[PDB]
Amino acid sequence: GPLGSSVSELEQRLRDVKNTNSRFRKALMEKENELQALIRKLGPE
Amino acid sequence: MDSKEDEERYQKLVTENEQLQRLITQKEEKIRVLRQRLVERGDA
C-alpha cells in the first residue's frame, strides 16, 4: 500500500479503521433488523 | 504528497467510528430492553 508519499504507520491504521467502519456500518444496519424483528414480536397481544 | 492527505481521511473515518459505535450500542441497548418488554407479555 504505502510505498511512498504517505507513511506506512498512518495507512496501516487507516486500513484498520476503514475495515472497522465498513464492519460497523454493516452491524448497524443489522441491529435495525433485530430492532424491527422485536417490534414484529410486539405485534401480538 | 504527504501523509496529511490520507491522515485527513483517517481522522474523518475514526470520527465515524465514534458515532457508529455509539449507535450500535444505542440500538443494541434498545434491542435489549425491547425484548424484555415483549417477552413478559408475549410469552410470559
Side-chain angles (χ1 to χ4, degrees):
Chain A
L3 294 318
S5 185
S6 302
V7 69
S8 173
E9 304 309 289
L10 188 281
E11 226 185 279
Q12 59 183 267
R13 306 302 171 188
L14 179 33
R15 297 182 62 136
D16 174 78
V17 79
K18 287 188 287 165
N19 278 269
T20 289
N21 279 269
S22 48
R23 268 293 309 164
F24 285 4
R25 292 183 297 227
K26 294 175 180 298
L28 193 48
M29 78 182 295
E30 297 203 288
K31 295 294 138 294
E32 298 184 287
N33 300 329
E34 282 72 84
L35 208 297
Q36 56 208 219
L38 296 177
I39 291 170
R40 298 175 184 165
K41 295 164 55 170
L42 269 317
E45 304 307 281
Chain B
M1 300 302 178
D2 301 275
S3 304
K4 181 189 67 67
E5 294 300 307
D6 286 289
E7 182 171 62
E8 296 179 276
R9 305 173 72 188
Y10 178 72
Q11 70 108 150
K12 296 299 301 184
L13 289 160
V14 319
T15 292
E16 293 183 78
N17 162 269
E18 323 194 273
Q19 59 186 269
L20 300 177
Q21 291 190 90
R22 201 182 66 232
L23 277 300
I24 294 159
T25 299
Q26 293 176 210
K27 318 307 295 184
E28 272 284 69
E29 186 185 279
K30 196 78 179 61
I31 294 174
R32 171 266 170 165
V33 206
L34 194 52
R35 314 186 199 220
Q36 105 101 150
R37 297 174 170 195
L38 74 92
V39 289
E40 296 284 282
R41 299 287 75 176
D43 175 79

